[PDB]
Amino acid sequence: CDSYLDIRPVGSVIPQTAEEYRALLARAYLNVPNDRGLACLRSDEMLVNDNEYDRNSYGDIERWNDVSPFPGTSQFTWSNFYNVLFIANQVIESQKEITEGTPEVVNQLVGEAHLLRAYLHFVLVNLHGQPYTKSGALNSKSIPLKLDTDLEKTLGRNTVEEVYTSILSDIEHARELINKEKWETVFSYRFNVLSVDALQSRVSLYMGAWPKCLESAEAVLAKKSVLVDMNETPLALPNHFESVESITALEQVMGSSVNNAVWVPATFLALYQEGDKRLAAYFAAPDENGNRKSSKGGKREFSCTFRVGELYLNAAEA
Amino acid sequence: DAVVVTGYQTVERRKLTAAVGKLNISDETIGAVKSIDQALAGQIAGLSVTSTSGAPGAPAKIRIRGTSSLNGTQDPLWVLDGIPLEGTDVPQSNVLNDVSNIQQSSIAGLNPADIENITVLKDAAATAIYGARAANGVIVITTKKGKVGKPVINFSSKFTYMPTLSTNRLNMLNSQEKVDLELELLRSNFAYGDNKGGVSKIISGYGLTDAYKKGGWSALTPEAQTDISRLRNTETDWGDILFRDAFNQEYSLSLSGGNERVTYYTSIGYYQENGNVKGVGLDRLNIVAKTSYKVNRMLKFGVSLFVNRRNNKTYLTDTYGLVNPVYYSRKANPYYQPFDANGNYVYDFDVQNNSDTDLGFNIFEERKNTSNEETINALSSIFDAELRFNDKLKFTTQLGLQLDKASKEQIADKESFSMRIIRKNSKYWDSASQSNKYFIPDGGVHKAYENTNSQITWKAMGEYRDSFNDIHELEVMVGTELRKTWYETLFSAGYGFDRQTLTTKPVVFPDEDRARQFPLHQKTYKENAYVSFFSTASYSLMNRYTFGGSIRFDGSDLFGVDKKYRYLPLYSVSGLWRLSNEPFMQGTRKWMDNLAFRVSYGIQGNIDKNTSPFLLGKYIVDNILPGGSEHMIDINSAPNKKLRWEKTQSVNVGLDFSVLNQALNLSVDYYYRKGTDLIGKQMLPLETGFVSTNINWASMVNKGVEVSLSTRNVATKNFSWYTNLNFAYNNNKVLREAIPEAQTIPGREGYPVDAIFAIKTAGLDEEGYPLFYDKEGKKVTLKELYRLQDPFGLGFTVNSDVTPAEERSFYSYIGSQDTPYTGGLINTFSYKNWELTANLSFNLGGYVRTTPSYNFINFDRGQNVNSDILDRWTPENTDGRLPALITSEKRADEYYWYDQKSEIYKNLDIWVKKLNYFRLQNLRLGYRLPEKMTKSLGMGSASVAIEGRNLLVFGSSYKNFLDPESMYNPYAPPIPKSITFSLNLNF
Amino acid sequence: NQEYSLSLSGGNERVTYYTSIGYYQENGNVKGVGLDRLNIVAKTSYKVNR
Amino acid sequence: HKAYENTNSQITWKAMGEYRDSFNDIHELEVMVGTELRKTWYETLFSAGYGFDRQTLTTKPVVFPDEDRARQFPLHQKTYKENAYVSFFSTASYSLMN
């Protein structure tokens, strides 16, 4: 004499409210991998220490020793990318099942999930996929696209063109759904209206679509354009989340271990001119070989995914 | 009979295309049993019944055509008068002492004196109308109902004598050889439990431990010598202290009858049963009240009520059974007297398995300061309504309500070992004062459990039967069913409890982690709802060909919401062909009564109720940016939106043969059941958010044959005997299963769910260490087998390069615990007024891994041991077969590898033993009083009987054990033997 | 509020029987309070003998 | 979360023997003699859990400052009562001339 088979479990937390889905998405935001710093380890701007217990982790990354790395070398977090992608996809698939929330709040939750998915696919395809501008790379299989929450499916690698098409589609989906112009400073990791434009500008810059890159950079620059004047303040880092330059303080690019285990080579520092506030604000005092430790990261307060300084250069290059 | 009941509709025997087993429940077939699941052993071919315990009220493990799931419902479905029963599942546990805390099934509340038949649905053609609950088999219960006529009043009284449990098969060391072993160990370098024992406490008290070690018996003072010789001559009968014979009572009164319009049945039963362990017992009082009214020539309404009340009294033990009287029979020292010469308590401080001697145990103090009491109140009501629209169309609806409330109460007083161990486990270290304290307050503990299982099921069916041209018969049924189930438990604990004052004391837990080690109040709740749509069809042509089919659509809240799998059918197609009713074979009709071939194919389902389609998470207060903290949800379980039932694709080919006026019936059934989409843990690709999840992926196969032979050997005016041989062979294999990377025992893939893998040993070497085999077949020691390396030379610093995937190859498959060959022989003789029933049941082909008689590293000399310790290798007995007691003084690397890998010794092939036993389940002799004597006393009928239960077991040897199926769990009493006298009167 | 009752009685020269099923749901004037009762009655009487 | 469980049980057994006679058509006598044994149980259990999450069904520990405040907020209490009654009764009635 009973039906309506829809009784949920009463032993755990099953997210149904907009508050619970925001908690789930915040947990997803927490686990965004710090793999862009590990990738920049392969560039000319970082130098691992000369001691052991630090060469075994990052040396093979530094030397591009892909074929025969050390067993204990630091690995790229492929699992965390797809965990955050799973949670983003869950929030996307729950659009109409989110209760106890106004249409604007739910729409912004889904837009943040869309932009998180686009950003994760973007950084993943730039880590493990051939560059878009490279000839013969638009049809090379780079990474699988996590576009659902399926568990009994094996994902195959998508071509770079398909991945970038998905990224652009998700940016467009988020553009019509994020409706928060500014977030609190403590909550600033969440994507704001300008985050969509900043991500579009970066994606178009990486793709080579200069007109769209300039359009997006100017669109965000019409609202947020104030920079950090370090001639007035010679010790203020734009990388700081409290800065007026920050747009999304999501990704702490340099982890504690990675920051503590790298110097800045003198060859890179030679790019700075004599009068430059970045020369002293970013790094510490020289050493025996002129190598400087960087004070621009390594702790969670230097969290930054997008900011105005990057968009100025995006517009300039476009 | 010519009717088969499936719980949904009635099938004529000539139209039955399914594999169905049938048993008639009566005193002559079923012996003086008290549960209807203990009466099924050896009487249905393909239904294997195993005893969980010998304790009163303990459930039985029933498997129909093998095991059908790896992690799911493995128990059959019990159907009472068309309404499925809840609470009949037998939960499995890894802790061997949990067998002492098992929960009774609802089947225990049903008097077999009220059941008429038991029909077991084995095939896909028989079970596929149950959909998601069909894979494990269905046992449908038909209850007795009143017959049209004068009231029939049956009184039955049974008086049972249960002989005491004789612990002579346990092969324990008597006081003389126990003291001899303790003296021999005190002289050697074996140093474990050196502080434990009675010899080492007598000698250490006077201070000649070193004097005895160097000198021996001579170096011992006359006073200590007289103390030891007094120890040797102290003999205690622990079987008499712990166990006893019992007298059990059973009474039943039934009154049936009927009108042309109303049929009625009433029954009252009460039994009291005692266990062989002193202080345990179980009484059951039940009432049955059935009635059926013909409201009209079309409408018929019936109400059936079964109310039940069972009271169980027993002992509570530790979590790991150091108090357990059944295990204590193998553990108590033969020279330890529980009482002083002045009548005071003497404590056993060697109960703990470690070297600690601080908490003392007394069985007389435990039976006085400790109590476990449970009460089960059960109700089951079925309302049936039937409406005959035509002579062809008929609509029948049914509502079944079921309630089962179990209230348990465990009390441990301050002066008991249970409370002592509970207090000891509360030891904690406080930083405020550098010391160790106990947060559990001084006093007792009172624990209260309340578990309620409720169910409401509603079924509606519409059946249409037609015949065309006298040679076509069509039966079509269409139904719906809604079933909701609740399970709610509450547990409460109070420490500082005074038994007489009923007061309590506060507990200050140091952490929230210790607050869960000693839970004070917890509540669990579970709801489930199920919606099903049916259809059955049957078409018979020329009374010779029958084609049947079943379709069922099942939906539940335990399944995912994906549209791809939501409503998938659970169908069946079957066909009967009666070769006997064929015009080309009518010549062989003077001697052949029946030839028929059944072929069935179907899809069965199973529900795993421990898995959910929902995002189960937890709240964590973390922070992404400095200064901003918020609640976040961490995913504990993945949201499987494709969660579904577990498929079982099965085929069945059966032969029915009957010759010489049913002088010999044969029924063979070969079946193959391939189960796929089984729910289990899978190592998923990382492209989903998770490393592993429980999903529908695994596979199993159960393939076999069942044979039922029924012979009428002689039929004379006076003497007549019949034989029933039931046989079944089943082959179980796990086809796909995920094995953890860090698991060294091999997986079951290609082997039964109950597979036993053991490390085959080449015997013993010249020093008494076990000897192994390598891949070349050469007798290899543990150092060579594991390639042990000790670079530091300190002994305990030993290491091995052998990977888990390579340790997996050291194990070889022995056999399955689940016995492949099962069945029984039932002989029934009758001679005038005398009737003799002999029921024998065989389980052949199994293996059981028994716990080692003694550990060669951790042997506790403060506890009693088998005589197997006398067969061990010693320097004085160099031809001993069992491994010697080893020390770290010699071969330190091997000793400390055996020490950390404690499962190498426990998985040796010498502790695995065969399981081939025949058991005399029942031997009954009856006598019906002559009609003259019954008429003299005004009795419609009278009968007496003497029954013997479990009087004889033979087969493979079970040495050092009390029962062939007591070889796995030492914490459960063996199946009792009984001699019962029954008096039945028919007024 | 709802109430339903179904009773079936009868008798023989030797057995008299009564059965009854009732169910009511009642609500209180205060919002959120209510009480339902479901009950069964099953009486039977047999003349085993004169 | 507060949980109460109150159980009231009773078992009563009565036996009576009645004798009815009439004499001379004007005397009627009815005599009844009986015994009764009745036993009653009343058992209550109360349990309380603070820190309770309704959806998670979890609980949090309570540290009472004293034993007096541990009774102001009882966490687990049990009450039990048995009673037994034995009765022997008789009735008589005598009617004359209706």
From TrEMBL, chain A:
Location within or outside the cell: Cell outer membrane
Superkingdom of this protein's organism: Bacteria
Cellular component GO terms held in the UniProt record: cell outer membrane
Record bears the keyword Membrane: yes
Keyword list, A-Z: Cell outer membrane, Membrane, Signal
Domain SusD-like N-terminal: 46-205
Chief location: membrane
Family membership: Belongs to the SusD family.
Name of this protein: Membrane protein
Organism encoding this protein: Bacteroides fragilis
First-to-last residue of the parent protein present: 19 to 336 of 443
From TrEMBL, chain C:
UniProt superkingdom: Bacteria
Cellular compartments annotated: Cell outer membrane
Family (UniProt): Belongs to the TonB-dependent receptor family.
The protein's name: SusC/RagA family TonB-linked outer membrane protein
Species, as recorded: Bacteroides fragilis
